[PDB]
Every structure is written in structure tokens, then in C-alpha cells.
Design a protein around this nucleic acid. Sequence first.
DNA 1: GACCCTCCCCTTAGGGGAGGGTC
DNA 2: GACCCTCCCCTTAGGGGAGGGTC
Lengths: 276, 276
Amino acid sequence: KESYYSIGEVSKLANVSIKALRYYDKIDLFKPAYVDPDTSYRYYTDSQLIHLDLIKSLKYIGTPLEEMKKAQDLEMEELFAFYTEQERQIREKLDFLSALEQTISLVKKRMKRQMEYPALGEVFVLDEEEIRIIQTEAEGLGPENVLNASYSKLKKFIESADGFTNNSYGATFSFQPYTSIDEMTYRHIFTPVLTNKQISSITPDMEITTIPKGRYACIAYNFSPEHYFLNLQKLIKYIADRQLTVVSDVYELIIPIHYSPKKQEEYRVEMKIRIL
Amino acid sequence: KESYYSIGEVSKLANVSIKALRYYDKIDLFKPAYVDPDTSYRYYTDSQLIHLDLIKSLKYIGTPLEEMKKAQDLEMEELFAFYTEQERQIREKLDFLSALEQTISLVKKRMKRQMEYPALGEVFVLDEEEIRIIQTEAEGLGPENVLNASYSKLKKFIESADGFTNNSYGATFSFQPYTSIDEMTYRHIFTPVLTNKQISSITPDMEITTIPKGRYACIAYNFSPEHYFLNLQKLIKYIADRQLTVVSDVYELIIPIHYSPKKQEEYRVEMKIRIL
DNA sequence: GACCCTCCCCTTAGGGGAGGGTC
DNA sequence: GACCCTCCCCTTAGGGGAGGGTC
Ligand SMILES: CC[n+]1c(-c2ccccc2)c2cc(N)ccc2c2ccc(N)cc21
Ligand SMILES: CC[n+]1c(-c2ccccc2)c2cc(N)ccc2c2ccc(N)cc21
């Protein structure tokens, strides 16, 4: 009342660090009422402690410091408004994050499936859920000459909506009795969608579509140039032996086992085709 | 395939800035496959573009860069785990924020009431909702000698739970036919609670309680030392004239109209008492 | 002894230059 | 011409010292 608080006093009283008070002083957000012309010691009054309330609350909600300066100068009505601003900014952060919880949750579901592989290199028939995907005409591309860059445009579309880029790389081609790799060309290349958020101004050359719900003859394995083709062969054979009727392209997905530059790269390949 | 991408090429392809690639290089998160010993130009392969997926997704969810380095080295199972970590960290952020939406919403409701004052300086009788509060025995304090520092301990308790410090400052005293200020002493001083989150290890000397739901004889005004007492007088008179029966202490709240150091300080005073 | 002062260095993830040199 | 290089300065909100000087 009729004396001042030293810095340490204020700091214990308002639960704000000395360093912070000192800094709040440098920026002129909150200044000691008095500074001893000799010692440079900061001294504060009791009445001024109340200006800290605003500072602490705004800090708590994450208002930048230089905004608080603008905030101090408000009568209630205008400060009421100010708060609705903070509210809608918090709702955005909420929507953003809840979207994010759902996405990761899904990314996870997809990882689990690809570690619960029944076995590698043998053919399974399984019942699959729909997978939404964006795809593009693969303009004469195939296994021997497709690049990561081929996917770039698709990826830009996905990332803009989903946020989460990392995924598998897909392509499709016709089920034929192929007798070598060079014999084969992809129909479409594609990548899966994870969200249900409208894609911004998608352009004609992309197609939003799905790998439909159905029974599927599958084969999955860890990639090796040798095994690519010979595994497809198993799949062809499997189908011929059981006289199954195929009802879609061959769908091939490729997904990195890891993303380390320090280790040898390695991929999971999965090839599936729908049967009746 | 049999050549490299320059930096600008990669940047267009992965939608990552040159500055970022350059930086990701400085930290060894992602390094060009080749650097021209003469020009220092960075050159990248197609195969390596895939390491960016992880980088971009993790960046999207806000993993610090130095964590991504640890993240790259994971097989799927361990990376699955990693993701559940990210999930629970997102839930915390969600709980935090949703708490925050509710708090501000309330802070707002309270501001509206104190701008919908029916009029200042005249007495109203109104029906009030409960207000939860923490209070402490005011050890002989009163109007003439209470400080902001008096509230400090209460405030520490509130802030630890609510996050939001800024509020009104309350006190209570006995309804007597006072004939001067020095005649009066506060019973308890208090501050309102905003959350319903358990207060951490509150200590006996605090009381969690409320200003109960009821009818109340009120008077509110903008503070002036003169008007403090004379307004109380109106309230006493009001009650005597209508022979009302009082059923609680006088509750006094004080709230800053603004938090500017640059303007003259100014307070709203509200004095209310419960009647049957 | 305890408290306070200034000044200097640190962390994040780059963006915006300037002034080279290179495709 | 357009692209790329290095190096230097910038923003946030302080925390952790060191080496004074002061309660
Ligand atoms: C789908 C083709 N394909 C092959 C491949 C398949 C058969 C023969 C030769 C290469 C490949 C081979 C190596 N080593 C490394 C990466 C990839 C790859 C990477 C992405 C992608 N979308 C397709 C990819
Ligand atoms: C409730 C008392 N009171 C009075 C006051 C009331 C009557 C006579 C003299 C001072 C006050 C007067 C001025 N100028 C500035 C701040 C305050 C204040 C601030 C906080 C608080 N909790 C109580 C406060």
C-alpha cells in the first residue's frame, strides 16, 4: 500500500517468473511503477497487480504478447467481442484436431491389417471393405518404369484434404495370362483417400472412386524384383485351378516397411483381384 | 531414374519449400543423395522421395523434427505404437481445449450480466443463480485496508484448476446499520470458481462454497471512494423501508472495467444481499 | 546470505533478403 | 534468364547461466 513490492515479491504473489516480469517490462506490456535510478531495481504497487490477471488469462489461452497490448485497451463490450474471436479460433483448433484423431485412427487400422497378413507369398481369398481412392490414367506406364514422381499430382490432392501424405502407392492392370513383365502396362495409378473432406477444385484428370467391397484373391509379400512376377504367376495359377471368375483389374499396392535413409529400403507388395 | 532431381524439382514434386529441404539437410533428417563437390548443388534420386512422406505427415501432426529422426528408424509395430502416443497426446490437447471453450463461454456469460445492469446506483431486487466460490477467513481485514495481495493464495488455487485467473474480487460482511466505514470489517474474502475440475490438494484454510440461488437486493455502480458507503446506505434504507428480511451477508464484488496501464483505473462495484 | 541487476547464449523451423556463381 | 548456392538477420517467450552490485 504505502510501499512497493520488489520483483521477487510480485513473482511469488502472481505466480509469474521474475524473468517473465523482466521481459513483460522490456516489451511494455507490464512495467514496474517505479525503477530506482541507481540500482535499476524494479518496484511495483499493489494496485497494479490487477493488470496481471488479463495477462495471465490471455497467456493461458495463448494470445501472443503483442496482441495483449491491444487487448488491454478495451472497454468490456469490445473485450467481449475479443473473446468471441478467441472462441471461434478455438473451435477451428478443435475441428482440426478431431479430424486428426480420426485420421490417425484410420492410418492405424490400416497398419494392423498389414501385420495381420495371414502369410506372405501364399494366396488367400478374403472379404474386403471398400477403400476410397483417387486415381489417374497411367499414360502407358508400367512396373518397369513408374516413378514416385508419377504420384506427385495425386499426392498434392490428397495432402491438401487429408493432411496426412504417407500411405501406399497403388496401381491397376488387366488380368491376362502374362508371360513376362514387359508384356504388362498399368491402366490407372492410384492412391487411397483417408478423409471425407471435399477435395478443393479437383481437376477432371483425377477420378474419385473405390476398390469395392467384395471377395478378393490376394497375395502379399516383401518385394524383390525376382518375386514380383513369379508371385503374380501364383495368383493367375490359383485362379485357373479353381476356375474362379475375376471381376476387376488386378489391384497392386506397395507400401514402405520403413522410412529410414540409414537402412536398406524395403517394401510390402500386395496384389489383389476381385472374384464373384 | 537414371539422373537426379535438383532441389527446385523436388520442391515442386513434394510440395516442400527449398528452404525446408535445405534445412532438413542441415539437421540430417533428409539429405540429398548427391552433392556436387564444385557447385554445392543438391541432387536427389526418385527412390528417396518416399522418405518425405513420413516427414510431411509427422510435420502435419506437429512432431518436432528431432523426434522424426527417431521415428524413421522404426519397423511397423514400433511405429504403430508411436502413433498411439500421438493419439493420446492429441486427446489431451482436445480435453484441454474443450475445457477452454466452456470456460470462456462462461466468462462471457458473466460479462454480459454486468453490461445488462438494469441501472447503476439504484437498488434492484433480482433472482440469481448460484455462483460457486472459494473463500478464506478475512483476518480482521476491511474496505479500508484490503489488498490485491490478500487474494494471492486464493488465486493460486483458482488458476491451478481454472487456468483463467481474471475475474472479480469478492468479500462478505454482516448486514448492520453501519454509520461509517471504519465501523465495518469483512467476514470472508472470496473469489469465484469457473470450472468443475477438482482443486489439487486444497488446504483447510480455504472453503469451497457458493453464493446460493435466491432473490437478492442489489446495487451496482462504478466505484468512487465517496459512493462506496453512501450506496450501502441506499441498500440498508431500501430494506428498512420495505421491511424485508435479510438472509445472508452482504456480498460485495469488485471487477475492473479495463486492464489498461495507460488509462485511469476503474472498477465496477456490486453489493448484494439475500432476502426471503 | 539472499536478492536483484545486466548481458549473453540457447531452442524451433524455417522465411526473406543480399550478393555471389551456375544452368 | 532462371536456378541455385552460402551467409546473415528476423520472430516467440522467455530459461539458464556468469559476474557483477545491493538488501
Ligand atoms: C510398382 C513398381 N515399383 C518397383 C518395381 C517393381 C517391379 C520391377 C522393378 C521395380 C520398385 C522397385 C524398387 N527397387 C524400389 C521401388 C519401387 C517402386 C516404388 C514406388 C512405386 N510406386 C513402384 C515401385
Ligand atoms: C474493496 C475495497 N477496494 C477499494 C476501496 C474501497 C473503499 C474505500 C477505499 C478503497 C479500492 C480502491 C481503489 N482506489 C482501487 C482499488 C480498490 C480495491 C481493489 C481490489 C479490491 N479487492 C478491493 C478494493
